[PDB]
Write a protein that binds this ligand. Structure first.
Ligand SMILES: [Mg+2]
Ligand SMILES: [Mg+2]
Ligand SMILES: [Mg+2]
Ligand SMILES: [Mg+2]
Ligand SMILES: [Mg+2]
Length: 215
DNA sequence: CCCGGACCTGTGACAAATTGCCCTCAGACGG
DNA sequence: CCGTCTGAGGGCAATTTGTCACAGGTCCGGG
């Protein structure tokens, strides 16, 4: 059975901007850390390729560029801002990378106030905003596999750090909402629907319902 | 009143970024 | 040693994401 990611809801709801490749790596860090810390984690090229069905070469490319793109990135818990890394990554051995996560982030990674999903649920998603949506939905999932939640549009925009043109609602619909609901429905075992909540002419919330395809 | 104006929607265009692929060649290891 | 399995480089064209102009709906209010 595949690895079970668990994380504090504060991370599920944090404001940050990460790529797909970076989020893939971030899932393993939370896994390494939780299985124990000083904050030093490690990534093997060949294991990454096998986990995500890549070649060794393209794995190397993904790890390398992800790693240098973390520099200057910051995380906000709603507020408090932290850097993800406190030293550049470096490779002691061929095919091996060593990384230094901000140890002050440990408690934000690790009661009842948590989110969980198996890694096989997300590893075919491509768009990182859809990984963010699927994580938020998991946070409200019931044991049996269903749930329903209303997310406010401004809060979606702030937390997922969506780009500026998606403050225009027709672009929000076309390039973020429809695409990410389609991936989830095509790439995960979840079957997802939604409806819009209005106040006057403005659309304010999105109401999500979902069930599991083992029913 | 009835136009111009402030709102809202969707779609056609184009620019910028990301995807999985492809090829080269030296490192690490063992037979 | 050398042949093989790796992975660190350099690239590519086809798709997807991010941006903005313009057509086309509603309601408001003062010349
Ligand atoms: Mg890649
Ligand atoms: Mg209005
Ligand atoms: Mg006219
Ligand atoms: Mg027409
Ligand atoms: Mg008009």
């Amino acid at each position: 059975n595949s690895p079970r990611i668990v994380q504090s809801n504060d991370l599920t709801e944090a404001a940050y901007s990460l790529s797909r490749d970076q989020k893939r790596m971030l899932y393993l860090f939370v896994d390494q850390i939780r299985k124990s810390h000083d904050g030093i984690c490690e990534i093997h090229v060949a294991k990454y390729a096998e986990i995500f069905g890549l070649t060794s070469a393209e794995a190397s490319k993904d790890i390398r560029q992800a790693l240098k793109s973390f520099a200057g990135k910051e995380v906000v818990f709603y507020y408090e801002s932290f850097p993800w890394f406190i030293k550049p990554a470096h490779s002691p051995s061929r095919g091996l990378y060593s990384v230094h996560i901000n140890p002050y982030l440990i408690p934000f990674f690790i009661q009842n106030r948590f989110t969980q999903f198996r890694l096989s649920e997300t590893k075919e998603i491509t768009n990182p905003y859809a990984m963010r949506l699927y994580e938020s939905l998991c946070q409200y999932r019931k044991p049996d596999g269903s749930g329903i939640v209303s997310l406010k549009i401004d809060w979606i925009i702030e937390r997922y750090q969506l780009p500026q043109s998606y403050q225009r609602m027709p672009d929000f619909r076309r390039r973020f909402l429809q695409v990410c609901v389609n991936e989830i429905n095509s790439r995960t075992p979840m079957r997802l629907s939604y409806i819009e909540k209005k106040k006057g002419r403005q659309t304010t919330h999105i109401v999500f319902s979902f069930r599991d395809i083992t029913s």
